Every structure is written in structure tokens, then in C-alpha cells.
């Protein structure tokens, strides 16, 4: 009907997507073993006749120890037991080896389960690829998958959630390579691929959220409440609905410029909420300060070129359009001039659900402000410089050119990003006649 499939590939996918289904199964009355003690769930569930629902998921990676604890956790019984795909030997942060030596032994059975899931339910409209630019199996293996699902399924929409290496926080040294080797495949065979880093999640967990010492558990949970909010009106009623096919026609100006952010702005601790009410006019002002933007870029150096405002809960549509017009008057938030209308909202009738045993607070309001900007121009150009000084004397090339692939694909990266950097300066200029 209104449905999509979720693919978790790489460790940054299958761990982030580990944390999303507990909210999703507690989004409804489904007790997490598989049963349910109301045609909302079927968008991301394939119901069986026994009453058991089946999560729409597939988990593909080359490491066995990361999928196996899901198979020994508490979600071995909720899930169908053989889309938990598991290899034996590792690519291990090598771009050429998760794509041309080791991942190729498992590809033809992944797409089989893709065809198997897609041909049961009729109304597919998108895909949810959970990955990142930070490894080998999350990056190079997926870079074949994003060109399987496009040429073979036609003009189906397809959405990705990929984290981005911060200028100061990056675990791996070769992470300047396998990001820019991934992006040769992204622009030509996708529609959107949202951005986040790992550093700026921590700062919101310190400042706006009270609880210190953040593990990966609480960091995953923040993206779990964002991809819920993109798909919030597909499964629920709304005063003003948003589907998923129209996201590709009004958030995307240009045929290469499709890289927006997100901002779950009401994030607040349990005792911080008790000394500050969460009225709608101060809800929407939490989107636009640079502290709550999920990527470490300064919005005050760039021009916005669109926006979106996905609300939930006890939002009357009279406060929102009044709070729409006040932000137009301000000068610290500036817009590009070939978008006088700018903005876009969506309201819904359901309250967002806080995870029990969790670190947010119960509310009846929310905003997920997905928008694009000029601010990612500098974030792209810095990682071209980290790519340059390692390729200035061919540092880590002997794990790539020895895998049977030419140095010339490292030359096509500089053809890629330099030709995709002048666009943020060419058509990002004033009005010229």
C-alpha cells in the first residue's frame, strides 16, 4: 500500500537499525516476540495468518559477530530467521574487497530476498538503506546495491541514512578514502541520502539532554526518533499528511543537490522539561540555532534553499502558521532568493512515544525539521583535502591496486568532487541578468 523495505548493511546500519525496531514495535501494541494482544502496521510489516507480524528487514554484512547477537538476543523470535544474512570472512574497511572479492559471493541471494519481499506487498514507494561512509562493508558493498535497485526496479524512490566523518572525530585512518570512493555511485543512482556526524550527537546529549557519559545506545536512539518522524503519516492519520513520493519533488532543487539534514528539535531531559513548558512557538525556534543542527556546520555561513516542518501531537494548525511568519522577519536566518515561498509543514494526530527506560521526556509536541542548505559546501571541501594529502604520495594504495583495480578510479574522485564543488558557487550566486 504505502510501504517501504528497510535494508541494514554495514555495522553502522545494523546497529543503528538494531535500535529502531524497539520503538517501532512499541509504536503499536505489538508485544516484541511477534504477536499482538488498525491497519497501521502493514506499511513496515508483512502480516501472517497466525497473527505474527514480520518486520520488513534484511541484514547483510561480511562479519559474523555483529549479526549473531541479534540472532541470540530477544529479536530472534520477532524476525523471520533467514534474512539475517551472515558471511564468514571480512572485507575489514577495504573498499575494493567488500565490492569485488568477498561481497560478490553473497550479492545474488540478497537481491533474491529483495525480490521475495517486494513481490508480496503491492504498494512499494521507497527503500530505507541503513549504511554509512565510514567502513568497507557499509560503503563499497552498498555501492553495488544502490546500482542494482535502480536499473532493475526502474524509477522507484530510494532513501538513505548515512553518517559523515567529522573533521575532528574519525576512528579509522582510511575513512578519507572509502567515503569519496562511495560518492561516485551516490549521485547517479539515488534520490536522497541524509547526513549526520557522530560528534554533534554527543553535544546535544550533554547540553539539552542532562544524562552524561553517552554510549552508542543513546546515540542510536536519536536517529530512531527521526526516521519514525519521516514515516509518521504513512502509518497514521493526519490533519495535513505527507507521503514519501513527493519528498523527491519539493525538497530537491537540482539533479545533484539532494543532501539535507534533520533536527528533532524537542529533545529535553525529564527534569529540564519541568522548569520550561514546550509551547509550539518555542518548539520551532529550537530548530534553527547552530547547537541543535545534527551536522557540524555553521548555518550562518550559508543560504537555506528549502525547508520542512514535520509536527506531531497536540499542534493546532493556527500556532504553526503564526510561528511561520515570525521567522520570516528575522535576519539571522537567511534564504536564497529563488525560493520566496520557502517552507512546508505537516501536522499529525498522534503523540510521539518516548522509549520506556529512556532519556527523553513525555510530551505531546514534536518537530522533525528536514532541510537543505549551502552549509555543506565547506564540509565537502575539507574531506577533499584529507583525500589529497594521503594521495599526494599514495599512502594506502597497496590494499587497493593489489586487489586488481587501477589507480585511475582515484583520479575520477577529483573529477567528481571538484566538478561537484563549483555548483555550490556557480548557481549559488546572486541574481544575474
Amino acid at each position: 500500500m504505502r510501504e517501504c523495505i528497510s535494508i541494514h548493511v554495514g555495522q553502522a546500519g545494523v546497529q543503528i537499525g538494531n535500535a529502531c525496531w524497539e520503538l517501532y514495535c512499541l509504536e503499536h501494541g505489538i508485544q516484541p516476540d511477534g504477536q499482538m494482544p488498525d491497519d497501521s502496521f502493514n506499511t513496515f510489516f508483512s502480516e501472517t495468518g497466525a497473527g505474527k507480524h514480520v518486520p520488513r528487514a534484511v541484514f547483510v554484512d561480511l562479519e559474523p559477530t555483529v549479526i549473531d547477537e541479534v540472532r541470540t538476543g530477544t529479536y530472534r523470535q520477532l524476525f523471520h530467521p533467514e534474512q539475517l544474512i551472515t558471511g564468514k570472512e571480512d572485507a575489514a574497511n577495504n573498499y575494493a574487497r567488500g565490492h569485488y572479492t568477498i561481497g560478490k559471493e553473497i550479492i545474488d541471494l540478497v537481491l533474491d530476498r529483495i525480490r521475495k519481499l517486494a513481490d508480496q506487498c503491492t504498494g512499494l514507494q521507497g527503500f530505507l538503506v541503513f549504511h554509512s561512509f565510514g567502513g568497507g562493508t557499509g560503503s563499497g558493498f552498498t555501492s553495488l546495491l544502490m546500482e542494482r535497485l535502480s536499473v532493475d526496479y526502474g524509477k522507484k524512490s530510494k532513501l538513505e541514512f548515512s553518517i559523515y566523518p567529522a573533521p575532528q572525530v574519525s576512528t579509522a585512518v582510511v575513512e578519507p578514502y572509502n567515503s569519496i570512493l562511495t560518492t561516485h555511485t551516490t549521485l547517479e543512482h539515488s534520490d536522497c541520502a541524509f547526513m549526520v556526524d557522530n560528534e554533534a550527537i554527543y553535544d546535544i546529549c550533554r547540553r539539552n539532554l542532562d544524562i552524561e557519559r553517552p554510549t552508542y545506545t543513546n546515540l542510536n536512539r536519536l536517529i530512531g526518533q527521526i526516521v519514525s518522524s519521516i514515516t509518521a503519516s504513512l502509518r497514521f492519520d493526519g490533519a495535513l499528511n505527507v507521503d514519501l513520493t513527493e519528498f523527491q519533488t519539493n525538497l530537491v532543487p537540482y539533479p545533484r543537490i539532494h543532501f539535507p539534514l534533520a533536527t528533532y528539535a524537542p529533545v529535553i531531559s525529564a527534569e529540564k522539561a519541568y522548569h520550561e513548558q514546550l509551547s509550539v512557538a518555542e518548539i520551532t525556534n529550537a530548530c534553527f540555532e547552530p547547537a541543535n543542527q545534527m551536522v557540524k556546520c555553521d548555518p550562518r555561513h550559508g543560504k537555506y534553499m528549502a525547508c520542512c516542518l514535520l509536527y506531531r501531537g497536540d499542534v493546532v494548525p493556527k500556532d504553526v502558521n503564526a510561528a511561520i511568519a515570525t521567522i520570516k522577519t528575522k535576519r539571522t536566518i537567511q534564504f536564497v532568493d529563488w525560493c520566496p515561498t520557502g517552507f512546508k509543514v505537516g501536522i499529525n494526530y498522534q503523540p510521539p512515544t518516548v522509549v520506556p527506560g529512556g532519556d527523553l521526556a513525555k510530551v505531546q509536541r514534536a518537530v522533525c525539521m528536514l532541510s537543505n542548505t549551502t552549509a555543506i559546501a565547506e564540509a565537502w571541501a575539507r574531506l577533499d583535502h584529507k583525500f589529497d594529502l594521503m594521495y599526494a604520495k599514495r599512502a594506502f594504495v597497496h590494499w587497493y591496486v593489489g586487489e586488481g583495480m587501477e589507480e585511475g578510479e582515484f583520479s575520477e574522485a577529483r573529477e567528481d568532487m571538484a566538478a561537484l564543488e563549483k555548483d555550490y558557487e556557480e548557481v549559488g550566486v546572486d541574481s544575474v541578468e
Binding site: 564468514k88 572525530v169 585512518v173
Partner: protein, 424 residues
């Protein structure tokens, strides 16, 4: 699932490998019988990387013990865990090589090569998905430098895919227990550098140093001096047999760490090392690791990191823990010591975390660190080799095999090339 095969060759390499199987097994729970008497369920689910299942509910390690004299192994049968080995693994000769590279590689290695490589094939191709070959030797004596050089000359050819993990107890800078050990060492590295994948380097003087300065023990015994090098080599493998938030294979620590193909010599280290008095005076969290691991008192080689620049740094943590402390501390140590690290590498340090610590210990760490301060070792070893070679002294045996004068000038020629490329 991804098994690696463990060897010990030569009395230097046999003894330090002899201690592994008592410490690794108590990291899993296998008794002196060979049975399983553990407490947790997670300490069996990846047991097959160092083990072969046997009938009756007994496991057995995969040590392939090889030597040329029968004197070394008869203690190893008589040791604490000498009854859990497969008795067909003990393969040994009868006439001594006796501290000779000529005998260990040409004379008495040309005969017992085939009776050991058949036991190599009998364990390798009979198990599912191989991942490595842990060989313990050194450059010290003549067997473990000569027989291990001959042995890996075929392992990289009938098995040219897998990862060769050779080990080395490099001779001490002040003196060592041989008088011809420059000849035992510079002949070894003539074939080591172009043929292995990655080598560890262990210093035996720094075995003694870090038990008196930091552990304050009054009786440093070789039973205890190998218990510390067993704790590090069992750490590179602690994510193959235990899970974690960000886990590390052996090659995953090799593709990241190694910058250039011919520069693959390492330097182990280990963070929690507390004196018997200082037990009650030390706190256990991450700022007590990054200062105790990164300091020159804890490294295990004759290097001068103040005189050099680290290429890459690895640090495998262990215990269930919260890793913003791992992120933001190793941001800072990168940002403090800006002249201790090379500049064309933008980010240097790779983090790895486990979830199950050593037994009875709250948390630990393990250091494997590449450095451009080890060239003076290969300068001084190849200098004192040229002190002996200049008057053709101790050429009494190597000329006698018929080896030409052209043999021993190539090892010195190519040890000029390596030390000219740590400067690079």
C-alpha cells in the same frame, strides 16, 4: 569461525609459545584435563579458532610444535598443560643444529621439512575457513632464526593468500646470550621482510625492566616474564572470540596499521601494570590508561620515540565500558603530541573495544604501535654485524657448507635499504 593456526619453533619461540595455551585457555575455561568447566556461555561460541573438537566433549589446541633437538620438548610434555596436546603434533629431530643458521636452513632443515609440512597440510586443509598462521620465533639462536625462515618460504607459496604473523624476540642492545647472534639475526631478516605479512618485535631487556620499575617483584622468573607477552598476543585476538561495540580482526588491524608493504614491524604494549604496593593506590578508568600505555616505560623495544615519529597507533580496549572517554582522550593525545606523529597521515589512532575483560580484572587494554624509531636497532645490529664480518671472523661454519662470499653481502646490502627507508 575463521580459524588461525598456531606454531612454536625454536627454544626461544617454543618457550614463549608454551605459556600461551595456559593463559588463553583460562580466558576460555578449559581445565588441565582438556574438558570445559567454565561459568559463562559466551566463552565457547567462537572456540574453534584455536581448537579442534574431539569425541567425548574434549577440545584440543592446534599447536604444531617443531624443533631439531629433543631436549626442549620433553620439558613441555612435563609442564602444567603438557597433557592437552595431540601427541602426533610433537615433531622433532635427533642431531643438534646448535645455534647455527647454516644447519637450521640448509643442513638439518632440508631433511625434516617434509615431515612437518605434511602435518601443516594435515591441520590446514582439514578445517573450514582459515584466517592466519601465528608463528613464535626470534632472531636469537640458530634454529628459530634458520628453521622459521625456511618454514615460511613454503607457507607463503602453497598458501599464498593467508596472513603470516611471525614473531621476534630481537636481541638486547647491551649484550645477549650468544656470541654470533648478529649472524643469527641479519640472515633472518634477509628473507623476513619481503615474504611475511607483519612482524611483532619483542625486547628481552624490556621484559626485565618493567617488572622492577612497575611491578616491583623481587623474583623475575621466565615463567613470569612470558606471562606478560602472553597477555598482549592474546589481545589482538580478543574480538575474534568475544563481541564488542567496535570489534577488530587481525587483518583489520593490519590493513589499517601498515602504511607501506615492506615496513611491518611492531611494538607491543599493555596498560594495567600495577605494583603489589600500588594496587590499593590506583584508580581504574581510561585516564589511567592513555598515560600508562603511551609512555616509553611500557613499550617493548629499544627505540627512542622522542627521536622518532609514530606512523600508526592501535589500542584495543576490553571490558564493558563507555567510549566517549576513548574518543575524546585519543583526540587529545593526537592533539597534544603533534610532533610525535607524522603529518601526511591526517588521523592516526584506531580504537577497538571488547565486552568481556580478563578473568577477575575489571578492564584492560593492549597496544600495538608502529614507529619510526626502530631504525637505529637495525642500524646497530647491522653495525655490529659489520664489526664481526670485516675480519671474516666466525666464517668457520658458513664457508664450510659451500656458501659463497656473495651470500653475506646481500643481507648487509638490503639492511642498508630498510634503514634508508625508515628515514623516508
Amino acid at each position: 569461525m575463521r580459524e588461525i593456526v598456531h606454531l612454536q619453533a625454536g627454544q626461544c619461540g617454543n618457550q614463549i609459545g608454551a605459556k600461551f595455551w595456559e593463559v588463553i585457555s583460562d580466558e576460555h575455561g578449559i581445565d588441565p584435563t582438556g574438558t570445559y568447566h567454565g561459568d559463562s556461555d559466551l566463552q565457547l561460541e567462537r572456540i574453534n579458532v584455536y581448537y579442534n573438537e574431539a569425541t567425548g566433549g574434549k577440545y584440543v589446541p592446534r599447536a604444531v610444535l617443531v624443533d631439531l633437538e629433543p631436549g626442549t620438548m620433553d620439558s613441555v610434555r612435563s609442564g602444567p598443560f603438557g597433557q592437552i596436546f595431540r601427541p602426533d603434533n610433537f615433531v622433532f629431530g635427533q642431531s643438534g643444529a646448535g645455534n647455527n643458521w647454516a644447519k637450521g636452513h640448509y643442513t638439518e632443515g632440508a631433511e625434516l621439512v617434509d615431515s612437518v609440512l605434511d602435518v601443516v597440510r594435515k591441520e590446514a586443509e582439514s578445517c573450514d575457513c582459515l584466517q592466519g598462521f601465528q608463528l613464535t620465533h626470534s632472531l636469537g639462536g640458530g634454529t628459530g632464526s634458520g628453521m622459521g625462515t625456511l618454514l615460511i618460504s613454503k607457507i607463503r607459496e602453497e598458501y599464498p593468500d593467508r596472513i603470516m604473523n611471525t614473531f621476534s624476540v630481537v636481541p638486547s642492545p647491551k649484550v645477549s646470550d650468544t656470541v654470533v647472534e648478529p649472524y643469527n639475526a641479519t640472515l633472518s631478516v634477509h628473507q623476513l621482510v619481503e615474504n611475511t605479512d607483519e612482524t611483532y618485535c619483542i625486547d628481552n631487556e624490556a621484559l626485565y625492566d618493567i617488572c622492577f620499575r612497575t611491578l616491583k617483584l623481587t623474583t623475575p622468573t621466565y615463567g613470569d616474564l612470558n606471562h606478560l607477552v602472553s597477555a598482549t598476543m592474546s589481545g589482538v585476538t580478543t574480538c575474534l572470540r568475544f563481541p564488542g561495540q567496535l570489534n577488530a580482526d587481525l587483518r583489520k588491524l593490519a590493513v589499517n596499521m601498515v602504511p607501506f608493504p615492506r615496513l611491518h614491524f611492531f611494538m607491543p604494549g599493555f596498560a594495567p601494570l600495577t605494583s603489589r604496593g600500588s594496587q590499593q593506590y590506583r584508580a581504574l578508568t581510561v585516564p589511567e590508561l592513555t598515560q600508562q600505555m603511551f609512555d616509553a616505560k611500557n613499550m617493548m623495544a629499544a627505540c627512542d620515540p622522542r627521536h622518532g615519529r609514530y606512523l600508526t597507533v592501535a589500542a584495543v580496549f576490553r571490558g564493558r565500558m563507555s567510549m566517549k572517554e576513548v574518543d575524546e582522550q585519543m583526540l587529545n593525545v593526537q592533539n597534544k603530541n603533534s610532533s610525535y606523529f607524522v603529518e601526511w597521515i591526517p588521523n592516526n589512532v584506531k580504537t577497538a573495544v571488547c565486552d568481556i575483560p580478563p578473568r577477575g580484572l575489571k578492564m584492560s587494554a593492549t597496544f600495538i604501535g608502529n614507529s619510526t624509531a626502530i631504525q637505529e636497532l637495525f642500524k646497530r645490529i647491522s653495525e655490529q654485524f659489520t664489526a664481526m664480518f670485516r675480519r671474516k671472523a666466525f666464517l668457520h661454519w658458513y664457508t664450510g657448507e659451500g656458501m659463497d662470499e656473495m651470500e653475506f653481502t646481500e643481507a648487509e646490502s638490503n639492511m642498508n635499504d630498510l634503514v634508508s627507508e625508515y628515514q623516508q
